[PDB]
């Protein structure tokens, strides 16, 4: 069955390519300065933060807070991308609608962090679709609860990026994360795990063929999901330190994804 | 290398038997009224509890359960010594791996002594029900929910021995000095488990991943709410 595993891999990558406008390949080309196209506007200090908000578009009233809503606007945009990609996954839209919601409900945070790692090196993050680069030192230097809440994301990213996965690897990895059969409140786990079974097989082969010099990559990738679920837990906790940010209709768009 | 990987598997299993006096095989013989062993005393309520230990109750149960963690770190430590390469690692790092990896192993091995209804105590001589514990009041519910999920994998002692070695030797543990020698040991512990599951469960569909995915669920129980106070010092 090594032929349908290749065809499954490809066509998650094909849908991945169209669901997500900014890929890892493109993020690394920009980060490394590593070819033609363009250098991003760098946010290293308060004066660059304020100049970045003119030429740079921002579809999104103190400064460190103005960085939360921006990060929150953006994560909610990402949900609709992850939601579209989920639908390209063979078997997903035949699942019970309730289960589809539960898978996304719990899956989108873990996928957001995975994808946030593609835009991060140890020095900072690509923001505003590669057009910008906020430095890491500019982020530790934010106030009170804003001083961290990005810093552990970087911690995980530097470690995650060391696996040197490409977009074709991540397409399957993300699919694996969505079709996760232990989301609280799933009504029907049989097809969920039979789809995840395929994806794991497709992933195991992809890592084999794509990183043939890298012995236990499938297993080391799976261990990362234990770091992923922990980072998600302490972010949902740091957002009950940030119920202490006004809409309200924006509290009502941007409270979840969902 | 599939002779190296059988040798390693069988080495860890031997050390496992020798380190842990109550195995899962023993626990399952005791739990299912199997004949080789003797039925436990059952603690379902208050004068069962009273009659079993022949100030208050809840925190005195929490004193016992906390001390069972003591011999358990005495035993996990002894096992970790037999893991090829462990004692070669930097002294500080040996400690770092033990401190963060021990509770995840406790909960793995507590799944062996549990069913849907309760837990074995005193090397399998007693049996505390889930509801007498739910009568105190929360601290055991996640253990039981993981235990029920895990025991579905139908893992036995030879599988757990290797899987537990995989836990202890993780290079993601906060503040490891020399990460690379630790990853090197896990890599061959990883392909020894993969050979163990394909050879022991020839019919288990993608069991290897299913088991490492369960490493998530273990990490989250650990986020629960004085040789213990010195393991907890920062996590
Ligand atoms: C996984 O995709 C993303 C999810 C959330 C954010 C981002 C990039 N990004 C953005 C953005 O709006 O593009 C933002 S908001 C922003 C950036 C610069 C100036 C004002 C707002 C952001 C903030 C942090 Cl602390 C980290 C990453 C951030 C990408
Ligand atoms: C996996 O190794 C174990 C780690 C901790 C506990 C146990 C079994 N156990 C014990 C014990 O003393 O053997 C105990 S302590 C105990 C309980 C009643 C009377 C006397 C002691 C315990 C308590 C809970 Cl709430 C759950 C499991 C427990 C086993």
UniProtKB/Swiss-Prot annotation, chain A:
The chain holds residues 235 to 505 of 505 of the full protein. Belongs to the nuclear hormone receptor family. NR1 subfamily. The keyword Coiled coil does not apply. One of its GO terms (biological process) is negative regulation of vascular endothelial cell proliferation. A motif (9aaTAD) lies at residues 248-256. Rosiglitazone binds at residues 72-75, 109, 235, 254. The lineage of its organism: Eukaryota, Metazoa, Chordata, Craniata, Vertebrata. The keyword Zinc-finger applies. Nuclear receptor that binds peroxisome proliferators such as hypolipidemic drugs and fatty acids. Once activated by a ligand, the nuclear receptor binds to DNA specific PPAR response elements (PPRE) and modulates the transcription of its target genes, such as acyl-CoA oxidase. It therefore controls the peroxisomal beta-oxidation pathway of fatty acids. Key regulator of adipocyte differentiation and glucose homeostasis. ARF6 acts as a key regulator of the tissue-specific adipocyte P2 (aP2) enhancer. (Microbial infection) Upon treatment with M.tuberculosis or its lipoprotein LpqH, phosphorylation of MAPK p38 and IL-6 production are modulated, probably via this protein. There is a cross-link at residue 18 (Glycyl lysine isopeptide (Lys-Gly) (interchain with G-Cter in ubiquitin)). It is found in: Nucleus; Cytoplasm. GO terms for molecular function: alpha-actinin binding; arachidonate binding; chromatin binding; DNA binding; DNA binding domain binding; DNA-binding transcription activator activity, RNA polymerase II-specific; DNA-binding transcription factor activity; DNA-binding transcription factor activity, RNA polymerase II-specific. This is Peroxisome proliferator-activated receptor gamma. It is linked to Defects in PPARG can lead to type 2 insulin-resistant diabetes and hyptertension. PPARG mutations may be associated with colon cancer. Its main location: nucleus. Phosphorylated in basal conditions and dephosphorylated when treated with the ligand. May be dephosphorylated by PPP5C. Ubiquitinated by E3 ubiquitin-protein ligase complex containing FBXO9; leading to proteasomal degradation. Ubiquitinated at Lys-18 by TRIM55 leading to proteasomal degradation. Ubiquitinated by E3 ubiquitin-protein ligase STUB1/CHIP; leading to proteasomal degradation. It comes from Homo sapiens (Human). Keywords: Activator, Biological rhythms, Cytoplasm, Diabetes mellitus, Disease variant, DNA-binding, Glycoprotein, Isopeptide bond, Metal-binding, Nucleus, Obesity, Phosphoprotein, Receptor, Transcription, Transcription regulation, Ubl conjugation, Zinc, Zinc-finger. Highest expression in adipose tissue. Lower in skeletal muscle, spleen, heart and liver. Also detectable in placenta, lung and ovary. One of its GO terms (cellular component) is intracellular membrane-bounded organelle. Induction: (Microbial infection) Expression increases when incubated with M.tuberculosis or its lipoprotein LpqH; induction is TLR2-dependent (at protein level). It comes from the Eukaryota. PDPK1 activates its transcriptional activity independently of its kinase activity. Residues 4-256 form the NR LBD domain. Residues 1-46 are annotated as: Interaction with FAM120B.
UniProtKB/Swiss-Prot annotation, chain B:
Induction: (Microbial infection) Expression increases when incubated with M.tuberculosis or its lipoprotein LpqH; induction is TLR2-dependent (at protein level). Highest expression in adipose tissue. Lower in skeletal muscle, spleen, heart and liver. Also detectable in placenta, lung and ovary. Nuclear receptor that binds peroxisome proliferators such as hypolipidemic drugs and fatty acids. Once activated by a ligand, the nuclear receptor binds to DNA specific PPAR response elements (PPRE) and modulates the transcription of its target genes, such as acyl-CoA oxidase. It therefore controls the peroxisomal beta-oxidation pathway of fatty acids. Key regulator of adipocyte differentiation and glucose homeostasis. ARF6 acts as a key regulator of the tissue-specific adipocyte P2 (aP2) enhancer. Changing residue 66 to P: In colon cancer; sporadic; somatic mutation; loss of ligand-binding. Belongs to the nuclear hormone receptor family. NR1 subfamily. Phosphorylated in basal conditions and dephosphorylated when treated with the ligand. May be dephosphorylated by PPP5C. The chain holds residues 235 to 504 of 505 of the full protein. Residues 1-46 are annotated as: Interaction with FAM120B. Residues 4-234 form the NR LBD domain. A motif (9aaTAD) lies at residues 226-234. It comes from the Eukaryota. There is a cross-link at residue 18 (Glycyl lysine isopeptide (Lys-Gly) (interchain with G-Cter in ubiquitin)). Rosiglitazone binds at residues 66-69, 103, 225, 232. It is linked to Defects in PPARG can lead to type 2 insulin-resistant diabetes and hyptertension. PPARG mutations may be associated with colon cancer. Obesity: A condition characterized by an increase of body weight beyond the limitation of skeletal and physical requirements, as the result of excessive accumulation of body fat. It comes from Homo sapiens (Human). Interacts with FOXO1 (acetylated form). Heterodimer with other nuclear receptors, such as RXRA. The heterodimer with the retinoic acid receptor RXRA is called adipocyte-specific transcription factor ARF6. Interacts with NCOA6 coactivator, leading to a strong increase in transcription of target genes. Interacts with coactivator PPARBP, leading to a mild increase in transcription of target genes. Interacts with NOCA7 in a ligand-inducible manner. Interacts with NCOA1 and NCOA2 LXXLL motifs. Interacts with ASXL1, ASXL2, DNTTIP2, FAM120B, MAP2K1/MEK1, NR0B2, PDPK1, PRDM16, PRMT2 and TGFB1I1. This is Peroxisome proliferator-activated receptor gamma. It is found in: Nucleus; Cytoplasm. The 9aaTAD motif is a transactivation domain present in a large number of yeast and animal transcription factors.
